Amino acid sequence: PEYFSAADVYVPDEWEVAREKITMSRELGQGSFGMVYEGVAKGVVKDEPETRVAIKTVNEAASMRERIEFLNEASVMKEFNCHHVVRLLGVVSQGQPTLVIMELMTRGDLKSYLRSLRPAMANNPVLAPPSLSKMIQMAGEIADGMAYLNANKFVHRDLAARNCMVAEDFTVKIGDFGMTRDIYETDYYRKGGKGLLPVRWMSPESLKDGVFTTYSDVWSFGVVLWEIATLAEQPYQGLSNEQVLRFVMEGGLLDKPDNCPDMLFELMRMCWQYNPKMRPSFLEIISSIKEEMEPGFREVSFYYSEEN
């Protein structure tokens, strides 16, 4: 809705947390709306006196409209309950700065995580790249979070490794808004001279017609798999953003990464079917690899839940 829309207001509800129950520990990095911190919050998790959390803030210099948009975005997550999607824990809409309390993902974003693995292997011959089993586990976790979102009628539009997060126990989850690292702004292009678009992750139809659907999210998922298999190299390395636009719309595809397991590349190719409807749904993707997932997946996934 644009012509007739919701008002720019935020009504405090059960998600409101008293600032007295929060403490700031240290800075994590600049987010889209403002500095993000790591901290502690009391009474946000059942049977847990205190919880380590991520705290997103809104720059004190932002307009009231921007503070409202911030809260608006957080509110969308109030209805989410998926192990593979970073969880909203609370909101502080009174006083300054405005804050959103989120589940802490101690290992950061997946792109940064993947890139940090290369130098470690280069320094110790004992280490080897992530096994097929580990890559499949990540694939299923990401696919599960996306299947959950799609089931609730939501599309991502910017699915990429930089927007997936890694937990303390290495579980990968779909990240929350305004967390993309500043250094990855280079992953976006002013297509046609308009807004910033993640062209190297976009489907042919998104590039050509400007439409995004669950089908296009699946296309991006394919690119995320490619990122996992390449330890986050830049897709279409030898092409400028403009060249990528043409290459992909004309049916071009990313090359199979070196040493990439056959089954992983085959999944990529299915995610990159030119015709959107020919791509598998996230549920179909999971069904094709569920036998290779960790036993614990059956217990925490949306896939095996009663909601599916």
Curated annotation (Swiss-Prot):
Residue positions of the active site: 158 (proton acceptor)
Motif IRS1- and SHC1-binding in this chain: 1-3
Stated consequence of mutating residue 3 to F: Reduces tyrosine phosphorylation. Abolishes interaction with IRS1 and SHC1. Does not abolish interaction with PIK3R1, nor with GRB10
Residue location of crosslink Glycyl lysine isopeptide (Lys-Gly) (interchain with G-Cter in ubiquitin): 191, 194
Binding-site residues, ATP: 28-36, 56
Recorded consequence of changing residue 279 to S: In IGF1RES; significant decrease in IGF1-induced DNA synthesis and AKT1 phosphorylation in patient fibroblasts
Outcome following mutation: residue 56 to A: Kinase inactive. Abolishes tyrosine phosphorylation and abolishes interaction with IRS1, SHC1 and PIK3R1
Domain of life: Eukaryota
Chain positions with Phosphotyrosine modification: 3, 184, 188-189
Spans within the Cytoplasmic topological domain: 1-308
Domain Protein kinase residues, every copy: 22-297
Modified residues (Phosphoserine): 301, 305
Protein name: Insulin-like growth factor 1 receptor beta chain
Source taxonomy: Eukaryota, Metazoa, Chordata, Craniata, Vertebrata
